Protein backbone atom coordinates (compact mmCIF):
# COMPACT_ATOMS: atom_id res chain seq x y z
CA UNK A 317 0.00 0.00 0.00
CA UNK A 318 1.02 3.69 -0.47
CA UNK A 319 1.35 6.24 2.38
CA UNK A 320 -1.91 7.15 4.23
CA UNK A 321 -2.33 10.57 2.54
CA UNK A 322 -1.51 9.10 -0.88
CA UNK A 323 -4.18 6.41 -0.33
CA UNK A 324 -6.80 8.96 0.86
CA UNK A 325 -6.25 10.89 -2.39
CA UNK A 326 -6.53 7.68 -4.49
CA UNK A 327 -9.81 6.89 -2.73
CA UNK A 328 -11.30 10.30 -3.74
CA UNK A 329 -10.15 9.76 -7.30
CA UNK A 330 -11.70 6.28 -7.47
CA UNK A 331 -14.94 7.17 -5.64
CA UNK A 332 -15.45 10.64 -7.19
CA UNK A 333 -16.36 11.67 -3.64
CA UNK A 334 -15.02 13.63 -0.65
CA UNK A 335 -13.10 11.76 2.05
CA UNK A 336 -12.57 13.34 5.50
CA UNK A 337 -10.04 11.78 7.87
CA UNK A 338 -8.33 12.28 11.24
CA UNK A 339 -5.76 9.96 12.86
CA UNK A 340 -5.16 10.97 16.49
CA UNK A 341 -3.25 9.57 19.50
CA UNK A 342 -5.95 8.58 22.01
CA UNK A 343 -3.89 9.30 25.11
CA UNK A 344 -2.57 12.74 24.09
CA UNK A 345 -4.65 14.05 21.17
CA UNK A 346 -1.60 14.34 18.89
CA UNK A 347 -2.94 14.69 15.34
CA UNK A 348 -0.96 12.48 12.90
CA UNK A 349 -2.98 12.63 9.65
CA UNK A 350 -5.57 15.28 8.79
CA UNK A 351 -7.38 15.49 5.45
CA UNK A 352 -10.47 17.74 5.01
CA UNK A 353 -10.51 17.50 8.79
CA UNK A 354 -12.46 20.76 9.16
CA UNK A 355 -14.98 20.01 6.41
CA UNK A 356 -18.54 18.93 7.22
CA UNK A 357 -19.75 15.33 6.74
CA UNK A 358 -23.02 13.59 7.67
CA UNK A 359 -22.51 11.67 10.95
CA UNK A 360 -25.08 9.01 10.07
CA UNK A 361 -25.15 6.31 12.79
CA UNK A 362 -21.79 7.42 14.27
CA UNK A 363 -23.80 9.96 16.39
CA UNK A 364 -24.93 6.99 18.50
CA UNK A 365 -21.60 6.91 20.42
CA UNK A 366 -21.97 10.60 21.35
CA UNK A 367 -25.61 10.01 22.31
CA UNK A 368 -24.63 7.28 24.77
CA UNK A 369 -21.83 9.51 26.12
CA UNK A 370 -24.62 11.95 27.06
CA UNK A 371 -26.65 9.10 28.63
CA UNK A 372 -23.61 8.11 30.71
CA UNK A 373 -23.18 11.76 31.82
CA UNK A 374 -26.76 11.65 33.18
CA UNK A 375 -25.96 8.36 34.97
CA UNK A 376 -22.84 9.96 36.56
CA UNK A 377 -24.98 12.96 37.63
CA UNK A 378 -27.48 10.67 39.41
CA UNK A 379 -30.22 11.53 36.91
CA UNK A 380 -30.34 8.19 35.10
CA UNK A 381 -29.60 4.47 35.75
CA UNK A 382 -28.31 1.98 33.18
CA UNK A 383 -30.51 -0.58 35.01
CA UNK A 384 -33.71 1.41 34.47
CA UNK A 385 -36.19 -0.53 32.35
CA UNK A 386 -37.97 1.30 29.52
CA UNK A 387 -41.18 -0.22 28.21
CA UNK A 388 -42.23 0.88 24.74
CA UNK A 389 -44.97 0.07 22.25
CA UNK A 390 -44.86 -1.25 18.70
CA UNK A 391 -46.07 2.18 17.44
CA UNK A 392 -42.89 3.71 18.94
CA UNK A 393 -40.64 1.61 16.65
CA UNK A 394 -38.93 3.28 13.69
CA UNK A 395 -37.18 1.72 10.65
CA UNK A 396 -34.44 -0.77 11.61
CA UNK A 397 -35.07 -2.12 15.08
CA UNK A 398 -33.31 -5.52 15.10
CA UNK A 399 -32.98 -5.75 18.89
CA UNK A 400 -35.78 -3.47 20.09
CA UNK A 401 -38.46 -5.26 18.01
CA UNK A 402 -37.74 -8.38 20.11
CA UNK A 403 -38.65 -6.74 23.46
CA UNK A 404 -42.17 -5.41 23.08
CA UNK A 405 -43.31 -7.67 25.93
CA UNK A 406 -40.46 -7.17 28.40
CA UNK A 407 -38.82 -3.81 27.60
CA UNK A 408 -35.12 -2.96 27.62
CA UNK A 409 -32.83 -1.30 30.15
CA UNK A 410 -31.19 2.04 29.37
CA UNK A 411 -27.84 0.17 29.24
CA UNK A 412 -29.31 -2.42 26.85
CA UNK A 413 -30.65 0.42 24.71
CA UNK A 414 -27.15 1.89 24.41
CA UNK A 415 -25.66 -1.52 23.57
CA UNK A 416 -28.31 -1.99 20.87
CA UNK A 417 -27.80 1.53 19.48
CA UNK A 418 -24.00 1.27 19.33
CA UNK A 419 -23.39 -2.41 18.51
CA UNK A 420 -26.39 -3.03 16.18
CA UNK A 421 -27.23 0.53 15.08
CA UNK A 422 -30.76 -0.05 16.42
CA UNK A 423 -32.76 3.05 15.46
CA UNK A 424 -35.63 2.60 17.88
CA UNK A 425 -33.14 2.20 20.69
CA UNK A 426 -31.39 5.43 19.64
CA UNK A 427 -34.73 7.27 19.42
CA UNK A 428 -35.76 6.23 22.92
CA UNK A 429 -32.38 7.27 24.30
CA UNK A 430 -32.46 10.62 22.42
CA UNK A 431 -35.72 11.49 24.23
CA UNK A 432 -34.00 10.93 27.60
CA UNK A 433 -31.22 13.47 26.86
CA UNK A 434 -33.70 16.14 25.69
CA UNK A 435 -33.83 15.33 21.98
CA UNK A 436 -31.48 16.79 19.32
CA UNK A 437 -31.46 20.16 21.09
CA UNK A 438 -30.46 18.43 24.34
CA UNK A 439 -27.66 16.44 22.68
CA UNK A 440 -26.38 19.55 20.86
CA UNK A 441 -26.31 21.44 24.21
CA UNK A 442 -24.31 18.54 25.69
CA UNK A 443 -21.81 18.85 22.82
CA UNK A 444 -21.50 22.63 23.37
CA UNK A 445 -20.88 21.94 27.10
CA UNK A 446 -17.89 19.72 26.38
CA UNK A 447 -16.42 22.22 23.93
CA UNK A 448 -17.69 20.88 20.61
CA UNK A 449 -19.05 23.91 18.80
CA UNK A 450 -19.23 22.22 15.40
CA UNK A 451 -21.15 18.94 15.63
CA UNK A 452 -24.94 19.26 15.41
CA UNK A 453 -27.89 16.89 15.66
CA UNK A 454 -31.18 18.22 14.34
CA UNK A 455 -33.36 15.12 13.72
CA UNK A 456 -28.75 14.04 2.40
CA UNK A 457 -27.93 16.81 -0.10
CA UNK A 458 -24.85 19.11 -0.08
CA UNK A 459 -25.32 22.40 1.80
CA UNK A 460 -27.42 20.64 4.42
CA UNK A 461 -25.56 21.07 7.72
CA UNK A 462 -28.11 19.02 9.72
CA UNK A 463 -26.74 15.94 11.53
CA UNK A 464 -23.15 16.76 10.56
CA UNK A 465 -19.74 16.86 12.17
CA UNK A 466 -16.13 17.33 11.05
CA UNK A 467 -13.43 14.67 11.36
CA UNK A 468 -11.46 16.94 13.76
CA UNK A 469 -14.51 17.70 15.93
CA UNK A 470 -15.67 14.09 16.12
CA UNK A 471 -12.18 12.86 17.02
CA UNK A 472 -11.79 15.50 19.74
CA UNK A 473 -15.27 14.75 21.10
CA UNK A 474 -14.66 10.99 21.19
CA UNK A 475 -11.34 11.60 22.99
CA UNK A 476 -13.06 13.81 25.55
CA UNK A 477 -15.69 11.17 26.29
CA UNK A 478 -13.20 8.29 26.52
CA UNK A 479 -10.29 9.92 28.38
CA UNK A 480 -11.08 13.31 29.94
CA UNK A 481 -12.69 13.54 33.36
CA UNK A 482 -16.07 14.50 31.84
CA UNK A 483 -17.28 10.93 32.43
CA UNK A 484 -16.61 8.77 35.46
CA UNK A 485 -14.02 5.99 35.24
CA UNK A 486 -16.78 3.39 35.07
CA UNK A 487 -18.67 5.30 32.38
CA UNK A 488 -15.52 5.73 30.23
CA UNK A 489 -14.94 2.01 30.54
CA UNK A 490 -18.53 1.25 29.52
CA UNK A 491 -18.48 3.51 26.45
CA UNK A 492 -15.25 1.87 25.27
CA UNK A 493 -16.67 -1.60 25.86
CA UNK A 494 -19.80 -0.84 23.76
CA UNK A 495 -17.49 0.10 20.86
CA UNK A 496 -15.38 -3.06 21.36
CA UNK A 497 -18.63 -5.01 21.15
CA UNK A 498 -19.77 -3.63 17.73
CA UNK A 499 -21.57 -6.31 15.74
CA UNK A 500 -22.07 -4.40 12.48
CA UNK A 501 -18.43 -4.35 11.41
CA UNK A 502 -16.19 -5.32 14.38
CA UNK A 503 -16.00 -9.05 13.69
CA UNK A 504 -15.58 -8.43 9.93
CA UNK A 505 -12.72 -5.98 10.58
CA UNK A 506 -10.99 -8.41 12.93
CA UNK A 507 -11.17 -11.08 10.23
CA UNK A 508 -9.03 -8.89 7.91
CA UNK A 509 -6.75 -7.28 10.51
CA UNK A 510 -3.27 -8.69 11.05
CA UNK A 511 -2.70 -10.43 14.37
CA UNK A 512 -2.04 -8.06 17.26
CA UNK A 513 -4.27 -5.19 16.11
CA UNK A 514 -6.94 -3.83 18.46
CA UNK A 515 -10.25 -2.63 17.00
CA UNK A 516 -13.30 -0.87 18.50
CA UNK A 517 -15.70 1.01 16.27
CA UNK A 518 -19.00 2.56 15.28
CA UNK A 519 -20.01 2.60 11.61
CA UNK A 520 -22.41 4.79 9.66
CA UNK A 521 -24.07 4.83 6.23
CA UNK A 522 -26.28 7.27 4.39
CA UNK A 523 -27.60 8.72 1.17
CA UNK A 524 -25.49 9.95 -1.78
CA UNK A 525 -22.76 7.45 -0.91
CA UNK A 526 -22.32 8.62 2.69
CA UNK A 527 -20.29 6.08 4.71
CA UNK A 528 -18.17 6.40 7.82
CA UNK A 529 -16.42 4.86 10.79
CA UNK A 530 -15.21 6.16 14.15
CA UNK A 531 -12.65 3.71 15.47
CA UNK A 532 -9.92 2.93 17.99
CA UNK A 533 -7.00 1.09 16.44
CA UNK A 534 -3.48 0.01 17.28
CA UNK A 535 -0.81 -2.68 17.33
CA UNK A 536 0.22 -4.67 20.43
CA UNK A 537 -3.47 -5.05 21.26
CA UNK A 538 -3.76 -1.45 22.37
CA UNK A 539 -6.30 1.27 21.54
CA UNK A 540 -3.45 3.54 20.49
CA UNK A 541 -5.21 5.86 18.05
CA UNK A 542 -8.58 7.31 17.19
CA UNK A 543 -9.27 7.00 13.44
CA UNK A 544 -12.29 8.89 11.99
CA UNK A 545 -13.09 8.43 8.29
CA UNK A 546 -16.14 9.92 6.55
CA UNK A 547 -17.10 9.68 2.85
CA UNK A 548 -19.72 11.83 1.10
CA UNK A 549 -21.11 12.54 -2.40
CA UNK A 550 -19.95 9.41 -4.21
CA UNK A 551 -22.19 7.28 -6.50
CA UNK A 552 -20.21 4.15 -5.59
CA UNK A 553 -21.57 0.77 -4.47
CA UNK A 554 -21.50 0.03 -0.73
CA UNK A 555 -18.91 -2.71 -1.40
CA UNK A 556 -16.64 -0.17 -3.10
CA UNK A 557 -17.03 2.37 -0.31
CA UNK A 558 -16.15 -0.35 2.23
CA UNK A 559 -13.11 -1.39 0.19
CA UNK A 560 -11.81 2.19 -0.04
CA UNK A 561 -12.09 2.73 3.70
CA UNK A 562 -10.33 -0.65 4.22
CA UNK A 563 -7.59 0.54 1.84
CA UNK A 564 -7.00 3.64 3.94
CA UNK A 565 -6.88 1.24 6.93
CA UNK A 566 -4.23 -0.85 5.18
CA UNK A 567 -2.11 2.25 4.47
CA UNK A 568 -2.24 3.19 8.17
CA UNK A 569 -1.29 -0.35 9.25
CA UNK A 570 1.67 -0.66 6.86
CA UNK A 571 2.93 2.83 7.76
CA UNK A 572 2.09 3.13 11.45
CA UNK A 573 5.25 4.68 12.85
CA UNK A 574 4.87 8.41 12.13
Ligand SMILES: OC[C@H]1O[C@H](O[C@H]2[C@H](O)[C@@H](O)[C@H](OCCCCCCC3CCCCC3)O[C@@H]2CO)[C@H](O)[C@@H](O)[C@@H]1O
Nearest residue numbers: 505508509510529531533543545561562565566569570
Ligand atom coordinates in the same frame (compact mmCIF):
# COMPACT_ATOMS: atom_id res chain seq x y z
O1 LIG B 1 2.96 -4.86 7.86
C1 LIG B 1 2.53 -5.89 6.99
C2 LIG B 1 1.10 -6.34 7.33
O2 LIG B 1 0.44 -6.33 6.05
C3 LIG B 1 -0.57 -7.28 5.69
O3 LIG B 1 -1.79 -7.00 6.39
C4 LIG B 1 -2.85 -6.49 5.56
C5 LIG B 1 -4.10 -7.37 5.70
O4 LIG B 1 -3.89 -8.65 5.09
C6 LIG B 1 -5.34 -6.72 5.06
O5 LIG B 1 -6.50 -7.53 5.28
C7 LIG B 1 -5.52 -5.33 5.64
O6 LIG B 1 -6.65 -4.72 5.02
C8 LIG B 1 -7.06 -3.53 5.71
C9 LIG B 1 -8.27 -3.88 6.54
C10 LIG B 1 -8.59 -2.76 7.51
C11 LIG B 1 -10.00 -2.96 8.05
C12 LIG B 1 -10.72 -1.64 8.34
C13 LIG B 1 -9.81 -0.69 9.10
C14 LIG B 1 -10.59 0.45 9.72
C15 LIG B 1 -10.08 0.60 11.16
C16 LIG B 1 -9.73 2.03 11.54
C17 LIG B 1 -10.76 3.03 11.03
C18 LIG B 1 -10.91 2.98 9.51
C19 LIG B 1 -10.39 1.70 8.86
O7 LIG B 1 -4.34 -4.58 5.33
C20 LIG B 1 -3.14 -5.05 5.97
C21 LIG B 1 -2.02 -4.07 5.62
O8 LIG B 1 -1.76 -4.18 4.21
C22 LIG B 1 -0.18 -8.70 6.03
O9 LIG B 1 -1.31 -9.56 5.83
C23 LIG B 1 0.20 -8.79 7.50
O10 LIG B 1 0.69 -10.12 7.74
C24 LIG B 1 1.24 -7.75 7.95
O11 LIG B 1 1.26 -7.69 9.39
Ligand SMILES: *C(=O)/C=C/N[C@@H](C(=O)O)[C@](C)(COC(=O)CCCC(=O)O)S(=O)O
Nearest residue numbers: 360361362395396421423500519520521522
Ligand atom coordinates in the same frame (compact mmCIF):
# COMPACT_ATOMS: atom_id res chain seq x y z
C1 LIG C 1 -26.56 4.45 10.55
O1 LIG C 1 -25.57 4.79 9.92
C2 LIG C 1 -27.74 3.97 9.84
C3 LIG C 1 -27.60 3.68 8.55
N1 LIG C 1 -28.56 3.23 7.75
C4 LIG C 1 -29.87 2.77 8.20
C5 LIG C 1 -30.77 3.96 8.41
O2 LIG C 1 -30.75 4.90 7.59
O3 LIG C 1 -31.49 3.99 9.42
C6 LIG C 1 -30.46 1.69 7.27
C7 LIG C 1 -31.70 1.09 7.92
C8 LIG C 1 -29.45 0.57 7.08
O4 LIG C 1 -28.96 0.13 8.35
C9 LIG C 1 -27.94 -0.88 8.44
O5 LIG C 1 -27.57 -1.46 7.42
C10 LIG C 1 -27.34 -1.20 9.79
C11 LIG C 1 -25.91 -0.70 9.82
C12 LIG C 1 -25.82 0.82 9.68
C13 LIG C 1 -24.49 1.21 10.26
O6 LIG C 1 -23.47 1.03 9.55
O7 LIG C 1 -24.47 1.68 11.41
S1 LIG C 1 -30.85 2.31 5.75
O8 LIG C 1 -31.23 1.21 4.89
O9 LIG C 1 -29.68 2.94 5.17
